[PDB]
Design an enzyme around this catalytic site. Structure first.
Site, PDB file in Angstrom:
ATOM      1  N   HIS B 365      13.253  56.602  52.062  1.00  0.00           N
ATOM      2  CA  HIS B 365      13.446  56.390  53.486  1.00  0.00           C
ATOM      3  C   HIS B 365      14.378  57.345  54.208  1.00  0.00           C
ATOM      4  O   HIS B 365      14.556  57.216  55.414  1.00  0.00           O
ATOM      5  CB  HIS B 365      13.953  54.968  53.738  1.00  0.00           C
ATOM      6  CG  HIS B 365      13.009  53.900  53.274  1.00  0.00           C
ATOM      7  ND1 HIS B 365      12.167  53.232  54.131  1.00  0.00           N
ATOM      8  CD2 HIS B 365      12.821  53.349  52.052  1.00  0.00           C
ATOM      9  CE1 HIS B 365      11.489  52.320  53.461  1.00  0.00           C
ATOM     10  NE2 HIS B 365      11.870  52.368  52.192  1.00  0.00           N
ATOM     11  N   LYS B 556      19.522  51.058  68.665  1.00  0.00           N
ATOM     12  CA  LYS B 556      19.370  51.287  67.228  1.00  0.00           C
ATOM     13  C   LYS B 556      20.794  51.380  66.669  1.00  0.00           C
ATOM     14  O   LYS B 556      21.762  51.403  67.431  1.00  0.00           O
ATOM     15  CB  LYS B 556      18.619  52.598  66.968  1.00  0.00           C
ATOM     16  CG  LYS B 556      19.353  53.863  67.441  1.00  0.00           C
ATOM     17  CD  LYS B 556      18.562  54.585  68.527  1.00  0.00           C
ATOM     18  CE  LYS B 556      17.506  55.509  67.945  1.00  0.00           C
ATOM     19  NZ  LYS B 556      16.139  54.933  67.987  1.00  0.00           N
ATOM     20  N   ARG B 557      20.940  51.433  65.351  1.00  0.00           N
ATOM     21  CA  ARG B 557      22.282  51.529  64.789  1.00  0.00           C
ATOM     22  C   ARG B 557      22.961  52.794  65.308  1.00  0.00           C
ATOM     23  O   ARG B 557      22.303  53.799  65.574  1.00  0.00           O
ATOM     24  CB  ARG B 557      22.222  51.545  63.258  1.00  0.00           C
ATOM     25  CG  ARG B 557      21.840  50.204  62.643  1.00  0.00           C
ATOM     26  CD  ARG B 557      22.921  49.157  62.885  1.00  0.00           C
ATOM     27  NE  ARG B 557      24.175  49.514  62.230  1.00  0.00           N
ATOM     28  CZ  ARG B 557      24.563  49.050  61.042  1.00  0.00           C
ATOM     29  NH1 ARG B 557      23.803  48.195  60.367  1.00  0.00           N
ATOM     30  NH2 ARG B 557      25.721  49.437  60.528  1.00  0.00           N
ATOM     31  N   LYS B 562      21.485  59.975  65.162  1.00  0.00           N
ATOM     32  CA  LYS B 562      20.675  59.333  66.191  1.00  0.00           C
ATOM     33  C   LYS B 562      21.019  59.931  67.556  1.00  0.00           C
ATOM     34  O   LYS B 562      20.247  59.811  68.506  1.00  0.00           O
ATOM     35  CB  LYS B 562      20.915  57.814  66.198  1.00  0.00           C
ATOM     36  CG  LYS B 562      20.797  57.136  64.836  1.00  0.00           C
ATOM     37  CD  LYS B 562      19.437  56.481  64.628  1.00  0.00           C
ATOM     38  CE  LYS B 562      19.524  55.239  63.740  1.00  0.00           C
ATOM     39  NZ  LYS B 562      18.222  54.919  63.098  1.00  0.00           N
ATOM     40  N   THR B 664      11.044  53.009  63.839  1.00  0.00           N
ATOM     41  CA  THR B 664      10.058  51.958  64.097  1.00  0.00           C
ATOM     42  C   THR B 664      10.299  51.349  65.468  1.00  0.00           C
ATOM     43  O   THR B 664       9.409  50.735  66.061  1.00  0.00           O
ATOM     44  CB  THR B 664      10.124  50.858  63.045  1.00  0.00           C
ATOM     45  OG1 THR B 664      11.498  50.555  62.778  1.00  0.00           O
ATOM     46  CG2 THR B 664       9.435  51.310  61.754  1.00  0.00           C
ATOM     47  N   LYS B 668       7.885  50.122  68.617  1.00  0.00           N
ATOM     48  CA  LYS B 668       8.035  48.876  69.348  1.00  0.00           C
ATOM     49  C   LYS B 668       7.923  49.092  70.859  1.00  0.00           C
ATOM     50  O   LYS B 668       7.214  48.349  71.549  1.00  0.00           O
ATOM     51  CB  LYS B 668       9.377  48.240  69.006  1.00  0.00           C
ATOM     52  CG  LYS B 668       9.393  47.593  67.643  1.00  0.00           C
ATOM     53  CD  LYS B 668      10.795  47.235  67.225  1.00  0.00           C
ATOM     54  CE  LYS B 668      10.985  47.454  65.736  1.00  0.00           C
ATOM     55  NZ  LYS B 668      12.340  47.036  65.512  1.00  0.00           N
TER      56      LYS B 668
HETATM   57  C1  LIG Z   1      17.663  54.388  53.301  1.00  0.00           C
HETATM   58  O1  LIG Z   1      17.124  55.124  54.450  1.00  0.00           O
HETATM   59  C2  LIG Z   1      16.774  54.309  55.457  1.00  0.00           C
HETATM   60  O2  LIG Z   1      17.208  53.162  55.558  1.00  0.00           O
HETATM   61  N1  LIG Z   1      15.981  54.886  56.352  1.00  0.00           N
HETATM   62  C3  LIG Z   1      15.452  54.289  57.568  1.00  0.00           C
HETATM   63  C4  LIG Z   1      16.528  53.307  58.193  1.00  0.00           C
HETATM   64  N2  LIG Z   1      17.732  53.859  58.353  1.00  0.00           N
HETATM   65  O3  LIG Z   1      16.270  52.147  58.561  1.00  0.00           O
HETATM   66  O4  LIG Z   1      14.296  53.482  57.187  1.00  0.00           O
HETATM   67  C5  LIG Z   1      13.431  53.147  58.263  1.00  0.00           C
HETATM   68  C6  LIG Z   1      12.292  52.397  57.648  1.00  0.00           C
HETATM   69  O5  LIG Z   1      11.616  53.279  56.785  1.00  0.00           O
HETATM   70  C7  LIG Z   1      12.969  54.459  59.041  1.00  0.00           C
HETATM   71  O6  LIG Z   1      12.113  54.101  60.079  1.00  0.00           O
HETATM   72  C8  LIG Z   1      14.188  55.260  59.607  1.00  0.00           C
HETATM   73  O7  LIG Z   1      13.774  56.470  60.242  1.00  0.00           O
HETATM   74  C9  LIG Z   1      15.154  55.584  58.410  1.00  0.00           C
HETATM   75  O8  LIG Z   1      16.333  56.189  58.874  1.00  0.00           O
HETATM   76  C1  LIG Z   2      13.139  47.873  64.855  1.00  0.00           C
HETATM   77  C2  LIG Z   2      14.655  47.616  64.632  1.00  0.00           C
HETATM   78  C3  LIG Z   2      15.519  48.632  64.132  1.00  0.00           C
HETATM   79  C4  LIG Z   2      15.060  50.100  63.882  1.00  0.00           C
HETATM   80  O1  LIG Z   2      15.330  50.956  65.015  1.00  0.00           O
HETATM   81  P1  LIG Z   2      15.107  52.504  64.957  1.00  0.00           P
HETATM   82  O2  LIG Z   2      15.119  52.922  66.347  1.00  0.00           O
HETATM   83  O3  LIG Z   2      13.962  52.885  64.074  1.00  0.00           O
HETATM   84  O4  LIG Z   2      16.461  52.967  64.256  1.00  0.00           O
HETATM   85  C5  LIG Z   2      16.870  48.411  64.067  1.00  0.00           C
HETATM   86  N1  LIG Z   2      17.403  47.246  64.514  1.00  0.00           N
HETATM   87  C6  LIG Z   2      16.599  46.263  65.002  1.00  0.00           C
HETATM   88  C7  LIG Z   2      17.288  44.986  65.401  1.00  0.00           C
HETATM   89  C8  LIG Z   2      15.207  46.432  65.060  1.00  0.00           C
HETATM   90  O5  LIG Z   2      14.386  45.483  65.640  1.00  0.00           O
END
Ligand SMILES: COC(=O)N[C@]1(C(N)=O)O[C@H](CO)[C@@H](O)[C@H](O)[C@H]1O
Ligand SMILES: *Cc1c(COP(=O)(O)O)cnc(C)c1O
Ligand SMILES: COC(=O)N[C@]1(C(N)=O)O[C@H](CO)[C@@H](O)[C@H](O)[C@H]1O
Ligand SMILES: *Cc1c(COP(=O)(O)O)cnc(C)c1O
Lengths: 830, 830
Positions: B365, B556-557, B562, B664, B668
Site C-alpha cells: 500500500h 484525509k489524515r 498529502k 480512496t 468518494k
Molecule cells: C501502509 O500504506 C498505506 O496505508 N497506504 C494507504 C493508506 N495510507 O491508507 O492505503 C490506502 C488503501 O490502499 C491507499 O488508498 C493510500 O493511497 C495509501 O497511502
Molecule cells: C476514505 C477515508 C480515508 C482515506 O482518504 P484518502 O483521501 O485516500 O487519504 C481516510 N479517512 C476516512 C475517515 C475515510 O472515509
C-alpha cells in the site's frame, strides 16, 4: 413431582418457544451446534424474562408511593448461582423442568453449568445475600450496594496436598442476570488537597475515577417483589487519564487507564483479618462515595423534588433514608455524609451530625483484634484529606461529650478516642461507627453481650440505648427448598407450604416426632441425600466413600479459632484406637473437612496440608477398611455447600468459646437434618436453647472457663503430660508418622500447639472425644437419632433471616415488614 | 419516500412490537424513562434480529457446500456506524423509518447516537471495510480477521488551535452488533526457546495469552448473504498468570493479568509510518497465530474431516484456502504457517513451502521508506525465536534461487535479502511477503508500475508472474445510497436500481448530460446537501458558513506528502489578493480542511495549528466578509466523511506525484458530485482517464518531472526568489502575521519548506493557484459546472469495490463471484 409449582399447559408451551427464541436470536446458535452451556444460557435468559416485568413495576411502585428506603452497604455479597433460586421464588421450577424435559434436556445438568457469584469470603458475605432475599420477601424498599469485582474469591486447587489459588474469572462467559447501566455513571474523587476559603472548605486537585453501576434483580418469595442489588464498577475518565499533557506517551497513557480500573478488579480474600493496603481503602471509599450520591439523588426527587415544605430540608432525610453498615468496611459513609451535607449542601455541623447519626446504623461481626480495622493516619491523610479533617472534628466533639460525662476520667478519654496513638497513629473505624450511628448491634446474643461487657464497654456506659442484638439467620428458600426439595416436600405433606415464609410453623412438626411414617421418611431423604453426594464425589472428584457411615462434616473458612485442628486431633485418635484394637466394632465415619485458606495465612495453609496428610495415611490403611475415611472437600463455596449440608449427619461447630460471633453454617445444618456437636459459642447457645440441650451435643469450656484459664495462664504442657492419647498424637506429628519424606514438616503446628495456642485446643480435647463417643452411641440407634433430628428441624424456625430482618426493620430501620403480594407482573406499557 | 425499500403493512407492525419487546425485555426500561440512547438500542436490537437468521444459514451453507474460503487478514477494519448500513442492505430503511415515526421517534436522530467502530487509521482500514461489504455482496465465502481493540483511533479535540487526543471508549455503552464466542478461545504463545530433539524442533517454555473471538455480521447487498468478521480479544490464562508460584503477592498476580490483555487494548494511531515497538509486534503475531488455528481447524473438517483421500493431505489446502495479507502487518502468517506445517503436522520443508506460497497473497500500500516494516532481529529473537529460525531458512533458500538465476551478481544478493545488515540487523517484512506469496499487487496502476520499476525491481526480474495490480475501489452502498440518498434517488428515477450492485451502469447517465431536468436535479440535491451540512456545522460545532460559496474541502489524515501545506499556501494567497483589491469580485469559497495527526508526528500537529491560525485571521477580517472562510473540520472520521463528501463541490487530491499509492477519498468525492483538482498521482490518473482529462482539474509535476528535479537537486530558494506572491506568504509566516503573540511559532514550517521539503511544495505552487483560478471560472457558470459533474458521476463506475473484489477473486483467489440470492432468510430450526 414436588411442590416446585404447577407445570401448566399454556406456560410449558410458552416456556419452550421462548427457550428457542433465545437460542436462535440471543445466542445465535442452531440446535445442531448448541452445547450444554448454550442450553443453560437460553434457559437463563428465558427465566430472566419473567422477572423484568415485575422488576420494573416494583421500582416504579416505590417511586410512586415513596416509602422509607433501606440501603445495605457491604463490600461483600456471596450470591452463588441464581438460576434455580429465581425459579423457586417465581414458582417456575416444575414448569421449567417439564419444558426442558420436553426439549429433551436435563435441567439439573444445565444448572451445574452456572458459575457462582463468589463476591464474598464467608459468613459476612453470605449473610448479606440471605438478607437481600429476606428483605425482598418481606416487601421492604431495600437496595443492596456493593462492588462488582471481576474476580471473586479464588478457586481452590489441592496440589500435592497443598492449596493452590487460581483466579475466579466468573464473568468469562458473561452474566445473564446483570444489567449494565452506563447512563448512571458517577464520579468519585481521590487524593487532592483541602482549600479553606471564605465560606467553607473545598476538596481540590483530586483524581477522578468513574463508578459505573450494574443492577441485578432480587426477587422476593412468590410475592412479585423484585428489589435491586447495585454493584459498582471502576472506569477511567477519558480526559485527564489521557489529557494531563506534556510527554509520557499516548499509548502508555491509554494502557495506564488500568490503574484506576484496578479498584474493582479483585476481592480481598481475607476472612476475619484486616490488611491495611491502599487498594482496600480505595475500594472502601469507592463503594461509599458512589452509593451516597445515588442515595441523595433519589432523596432530592422523592416528593420533595416536587414540593413538601419546599427548601431542600434534610430534616426528613432520616425519615426517608436508612443506611446499614455491614461491619466497618463502609464506615467512611459517616464522614462522607458529613462532607456532602456540610461542604456541598452547606448545613451547619450540628444539623448535619444529627441527620447522619439518625440515618446510620452499624453491625459488628467479630471481637478478635486482628480483624479490627485501624487505618494509619498517613494513608487517610494522602488519599482522603478532607475526610481525615472531618474525623478529627468528630473525635474532638465526641471526646468533649465523654469528658463532660466522666469528669477527670483521663484514661477513658484515650481509650475511647477514634484516634490511636503509638508507633503510627491510626483511626479506629469501629469507634467511628459507634459515634456516628444511632444503633450498634451484635450478631448473636452472647456476642452482643460480649461487646457491652468487653470491647465496647466504655461506649455502652456512655450511650446504653445504642446497643442491641440481632441474631443472624439464613433464608429457608435457598437453604431448604432449593438444596433439599426432598425434605421440604415431606414437611409440606404434613404441615403445608406456608412455612417457607413463616419458618416458625416448623414447630408443628413436633407432633410427628413419634409418627412412624414421618421418622421413616425423614430418615429416607437423608439417605437419598447421602447417596447423591457420595455419587457426586466420584463423579467430579473421584475415589469412593461409604454412604452407610456417619457423615461427619466441618465446612467453613480455615482459621485457628475455628479449630479444624481440634477436629484433626479427634480423627487421629479414632485412627489410633482402631490400630490398637482392630477387631473391635466402631461406628463407621466419613469425616469431611473443607474450606479455603487466605493466601497469606501460613498456619491455615499448613492445616490444610495436615488434613490431607492424615487422609493419605488413614485412607490407605488396610486394617482400617471402610470404618474411617478422611476427605478434604475442595473449593468449598456456596454451590458446594448446597450439596454437602443436606447430606450431613454431624455438624462441627467447635470454635473456642467467645470467638465465633454467631456462625450461620451451624443454622444451615440444623434445618437440614444434621445433629450438632459444638461449644457454647455464638448462635450455638440459642440453637441448643431452642431445641433443648438434651437434643444437642455440647462440650468444652464456656466463656467463663476460658477467662478463668487466662487469669491462671494457659499451659499446654499440662494437658500433654496428663493425657497419653494426646501425647501419642503429638509425638506422631513430631516424628514424621504423617509426613515420612519430610519428618519436620509439621513442626510449626506442634510448636504452636505447645507454646502459642491462642485458642487452647488441648483444653477442650478430653471433653471433645468423650462427647464424640456419645454421638457414635446414638448413631447406633437409627430411630432415636432421627427423632432427635426431628427435634432440631422442628425447632430451627427462629433462625430464618426473615425473623432477623423483621427485627432490624422494626427496631432499627423503623419500617414495617409486609407479606403482601405486589399487584401481579401483568404486562403494562405506559 | 425514496427507494429505501417498501414500508409494508405487516412488517411495520412487526417492527414496532419487536422495538417494544427489546425496550422492555432487553433494555429493561419503560417508555417513561427511556432516552434517545435507549431508543437507539431497541432499534439496533430489532434490526440485528433480522440478520441472525440469514447469518446462521449462510455459515451453515458454506459448511454444507464447502467452497474455497477467503481469509482477509488485516490489523485494521475502519467500520464506522452499522445501523443504517444494515437497514440498507436488508431493504429495511423505509419500514424502520415508518415504524419509528409511528412510535413518535425520528430515526435520523437515533442514528446519530451510534458510536463509530474506529478500528482503523485511514485508507488501509477503510479499504478493508469496503472489501468486506463487496465480498458479501458478491457471494464469496470470505472472513475478515482482525483485533478487537477496546480503544480505536483517538477522538480529536482542538484546544487553542492545537490537537488534543482523548481515548475512544467506543464500547462504553456496549456493541449490539458483536457476538462474543468465548467457547472458541484459542491459546497464543510468546517468548520461550527452541529445543532441537531427535525428530524436529520444539517451541518450548512459552508464555501463553488467550485469544477470545467476537463475531460481527457482514450482510451483502440484498442477497441474503451474511458473512463474518472475527475480531480477537486478548485474555490471560487463569493458571500460570497466578500459578507460577513462590512469592510475589496473590493480589498483584491478579492485577498483573492486565499485561497479557494489553495486547488488544489500543490501536496504534500511525498512518503510513512504522513504529518498531514490541507491543505492535505482539499484536501482529497475536492476530496471525489465532487466525491460522481457526483456518486449519475449519480445513481439517471440510470434507477431509469425513473422507476424501483419507490422510491429512495438505495438498488440497491451497484449493480450499486463500489468505490475503493487507500490507505487511500480518506478514508473520507466512513463517507461522510453515511452523505449524513443519513442526506440528510434520510435512517436509519443500512440501510445506509449496503449500504456503500457494495460499498466501500480499498487497502493498505504500512506497515511502518510513512506512516500511523492518523489525530488529533482537526483537524477533526474544519474542518469536522459532519464527526467526524459519525466516533465516526461508532467506537461505530464496537467496540460493537468486544466485542461481543471477550468477555472480553479489550486490543483488544483499539487496534482495530478507535480512538487512547495518547498525542493527533487521528483517524486511516486505521481502518476506514477496518470497512467500504467489501474488503481489499494487493498489493503483501507477503505484503498481512504480513497484516493478523501483522498490521491488529485483523481485520483479526474478519472478515477473507474481506482480499484478488491483486498483482500489469503494462501496457504492455506504458511499452513495447511504450517505447521499437524494442523489441515488434521482439517478434511480432515470436508470433504475440495478446500478447499486453494478456501478458500471452509471455510464447510462451520460445520455442525460444535456437533459434540462436532470441538470436541475443534480444541482438541487447538491444544494440540499450543502444546506444540511452548513446546518450540522452550527448545530454541533457552532459559528456560521455560507451555503452559496464553493465548498472546497480536503479531508484525509494530516501528512507532509498529502500537502495540506500546499492547500494552505493557496488559501493565504486568496486572502492576500482580496486585501490587495477589496472591491474586486471573486467567487466565494468555504475551504474545509480536516484530518487527524498521529500523536508523535510533530510537523503534522504544527500544520493543524497553522490551518486554525489562518482561519483566526481570515475569518475575522471585515474586508473579506463572506467571500472567504477557513474551517478546520474536527475529529474527521467515517461518520463525518458521510456528511462532508456529499456536500463538497471541490475535492482536493494534491499529493506529490508518486507518493499516494491510490487514495480512496478521491473516489468518494467523484461519485458524490464534486469536481477534482489534483495531481497525476495514485488513482487520480485512472479517474481522469475514465472521465476524460477535460472534465478534471489536473496540475503540477508528473512522476517524471519529480525525478528530473531530484537528479538536478531541489532548491526551494529559487521558487522563493522568482515568485513574489510566494515570497510574501513566507515572510508573513516568518514575521508573526499569523501568530502575533508567538511570532516565531511557525519557524519549523518555514525552515522545513525552505530547506528540507521532501515533497517539493513550492515546485507545484504556481501551477496550483493557476489551476484553482480555472475552477473558480467554471463555478461561475452553474450549468457547465453541473454538466462536468454529471460527466464524473456517470463515469465513476470503475471505482466500486465490487469490481476490485471480482478481480482479486478471479486473478488471485481463484474463485468466481456470484450475484445469486441465498435461499431467503426463512425461519427454520433443525
Ligand atoms: C501502509 O500504506 C498505506 O496505508 N497506504 C494507504 C493508506 N495510507 O491508507 O492505503 C490506502 C488503501 O490502499 C491507499 O488508498 C493510500 O493511497 C495509501 O497511502
Ligand atoms: C476514505 C477515508 C480515508 C482515506 O482518504 P484518502 O483521501 O485516500 O487519504 C481516510 N479517512 C476516512 C475517515 C475515510 O472515509
Ligand atoms: C468481620 O467479622 C466477620 O466477618 N464475622 C463473621 C464472619 N467471619 O463471616 O460474620 C458472620 C456473619 O455475621 C458470623 O456468623 C461469624 O461468626 C463471624 O466470624
Ligand atoms: C454459610 C457459609 C459460610 C459460613 O460458615 P460458618 O460455619 O458460619 O463459618 C461460609 N462459606 C459458605 C460457602 C457458606 O455457605
Amino acid at each position: 413431582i414436588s411442590v416446585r409449582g404447577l407445570a401448566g399447559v399454556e406456560n410449558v408451551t410458552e416456556l419452550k418457544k421462548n427457550f428457542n427464541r433465545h437460542l436462535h436470536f440471543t445466542l445465535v446458535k442452531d440446535r445442531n451446534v448448541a452445547t450444554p452451556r448454550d442450553y443453560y444460557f437460553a434457559l437463563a435468559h428465558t427465566v430472566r424474562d419473567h422477572l423484568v416485568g415485575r422488576w420494573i413495576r416494583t421500582q416504579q411502585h416505590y417511586y410512586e408511593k415513596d416509602p422509607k428506603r433501606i440501603y445495605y452497604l457491604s463490600l461483600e455479597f456471596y450470591m452463588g448461582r441464581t438460576l434455580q433460586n429465581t425459579m423457586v421464588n417465581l414458582a417456575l421450577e416444575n414448569a421449567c423442568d417439564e419444558a426442558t424435559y420436553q426439549l429433551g434436556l436435563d435441567m439439573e445438568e444445565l444448572e451445574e453449568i452456572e458459575e457462582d457469584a463468589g463476591l464474598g469470603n464467608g459468613g459476612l458475605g453470605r449473610l448479606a445475600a440471605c438478607f437481600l432475599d429476606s428483605m425482598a420477601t418481606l416487601g421492604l424498599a431495600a437496595y443492596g450496594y456493593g462492588i462488582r469485582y471481576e474476580f471473586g474469591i479464588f478457586n481452590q486447587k489441592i496440589c500435592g496436598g497443598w492449596q493452590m489459588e487460581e483466579a475466579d474469572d466468573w464473568l468469562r462467559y458473561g452474566n445473564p442476570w446483570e444489567k449494565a447501566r452506563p447512563e448512571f455513571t458517577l464520579p468519585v474523587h481521590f487524593y487532592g488537597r483541602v482549600e479553606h476559603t471564605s465560606q467553607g472548605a473545598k476538596w481540590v486537585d483530586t483524581q477522578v475515577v468513574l463508578a459505573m453501576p450494574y443492577d441485578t434483580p432480587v426477587p422476593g418469595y412468590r410475592n412479585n417483589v423484585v428489589n435491586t442489588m447495585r454493584l459498582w464498577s471502576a472506569k477511567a475518565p477519558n480526559d485527564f487519564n489521557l489529557k494531563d499533557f506534556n510527554v509520557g506517551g499516548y499509548i502508555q497513557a491509554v494502557l495506564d487507564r488500568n490503574l484506576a480500573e484496578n479498584i474493582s478488579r479483585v476481592l480481598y480474600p481475607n476472612d476475619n483479618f484486616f490488611e491495611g493496603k491502599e487498594l482496600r481503602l480505595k475500594q472502601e471509599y469507592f463503594v461509599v462515595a458512589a452509593t451516597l450520591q445515588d442515595i441523595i439523588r433519589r432523596f432530592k426527587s422523592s416528593k420533595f423534588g416536587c414540593r413538601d415544605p419546599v427548601r431542600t430540608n434534610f430534616d426528613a432525610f432520616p425519615d426517608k433514608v436508612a443506611i446499614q453498615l455491614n461491619d466497618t468496611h463502609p464506615s467512611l459513609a459517616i464522614p462522607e455524609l458529613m462532607r456532602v451535607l456540610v461542604d456541598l449542601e452547606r448545613l451547619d455541623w450540628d444539623k448535619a451530625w444529627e441527620v447522619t447519626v439518625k440515618t446510620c446504623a452499624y453491625t459488628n461481626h467479630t471481637v478478635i483484634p486482628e480483624a479490627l480495622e485501624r487505618w494509619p493516619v498517613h494513608l487517610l491523610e494522602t488519599l482522603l484529606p478532607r475526610h481525615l479533617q472531618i474525623i478529627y472534628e468528630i473525635n474532638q466533639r465526641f471526646l468533649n461529650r465523654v469528658a463532660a460525662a466522666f469528669p477527670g476520667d483521663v484514661d477513658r478519654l484515650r481509650r475511647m478516642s477514634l484516634v490511636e496513638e503509638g508507633a503510627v497513629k491510626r483511626i479506629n473505624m469501629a469507634h467511628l461507627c459507634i459515634a456516628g450511628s444511632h444503633a450498634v448491634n451484635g450478631v448473636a446474643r452472647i456476642h452482643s453481650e460480649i461487646l457491652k461487657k468487653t470491647i465496647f464497654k466504655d461506649f455502652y456506659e456512655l450511650e446504653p440505648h445504642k446497643f442491641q442484638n440481632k441474631t443472624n439467620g439464613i433464608t429457608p428458600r435457598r437453604w431448604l427448598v432449593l438444596c433439599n426439595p426432598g425434605l421440604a416436600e415431606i414437611i409440606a405433606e404434613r404441615i403445608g407450604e406456608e412455612y417457607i415464609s413463616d419458618l416458625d410453623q416448623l414447630r408443628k412438626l413436633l407432633s410427628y416426632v413419634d409418627d412412624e411414617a414421618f421418622i421413616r421418611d425423614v430418615a429416607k431423604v437423608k439417605q437419598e441425600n447421602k447417596l447423591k453426594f457420595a455419587a457426586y464425589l466420584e463423579r467430579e472428584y473421584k475415589v469412593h466413600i461409604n454412604p452407610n457411615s456417619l457423615f461427619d462434616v466441618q465446612v467453613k473458612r480455615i482459621h485457628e479459632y475455628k479449630r479444624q485442628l481440634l477436629n484433626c486431633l479427634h480423627v487421629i485418635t479414632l485412627y489410633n484406637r482402631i490400630k490398637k484394637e482392630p477387631n473391635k466394632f466402631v461406628v463407621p465415619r466419613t469425616v469431611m473437612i473443607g474450606g479455603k485458606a487466605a493466601p497469606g495465612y501460613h498456619m491455615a495453609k499448613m492445616i490444610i496440608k495436615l488434613i490431607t496428610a492424615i487422609g493419605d495415611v488413614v485412607n490407605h490403611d488396610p486394617v482400617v477398611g471402610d470404618r474411617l475415611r478422611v476427605i478434604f472437600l475442595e473449593n468449598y463455596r456456596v454451590s458446594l455447600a448446597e450439596k454437602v449440608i443436606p447430606a450431613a449427619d454431624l455438624s462441627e461447630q467447635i470454635s473456642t468459646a467467645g470467638t465465633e460471633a454467631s456462625g450461620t453454617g451451624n443454622m444451615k445444618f440444623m434445618l437440614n437434618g444434621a445433629l450438632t456437636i459444638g461449644t457454647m459459642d455464638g448462635a450455638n447457645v440459642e440453637m441448643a436453647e431452642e431445641a433443648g440441650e438434651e437434643n444437642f451435643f455440647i462440650f468444652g469450656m464456656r466463656v467463663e472457663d476460658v477467662d478463668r484459664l487466662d487469669q491462671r495462664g494457659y499451659n499446654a504442657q499440662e494437658y500433654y503430660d496428663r493425657i497419653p492419647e494426646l501425647r501419642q498424637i503429638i509425638e506422631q506429628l513430631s516424628s514424621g508418622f504423617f509426613s515420612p519424606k519430610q519428618p519436620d514438616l509439621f513442626k510449626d503446628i506442634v510448636n504452636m500447639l505447645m507454646h502459642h495456642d491462642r485458642f487452647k485446643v488441648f483444653a477442650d480435647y478430653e471433653e471433645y472425644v468423650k462427647c464424640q463417643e456419645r454421638v457414635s452411641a446414638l448413631y447406633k440407634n437409627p430411630r432415636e437419632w432421627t427423632r432427635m433430628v426431628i427435634r432440631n428441624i422442628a425447632t430451627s424456625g427462629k433462625f430464618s433471616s426473615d425473623r432477623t430482618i423483621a427485627q432490624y426493620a422494626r427496631e432499627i430501620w423503623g419500617v414495617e415488614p409486609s407479606r403482601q403480594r405486589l399487584p401481579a407482573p401483568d404486562e403494562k406499557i405506559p
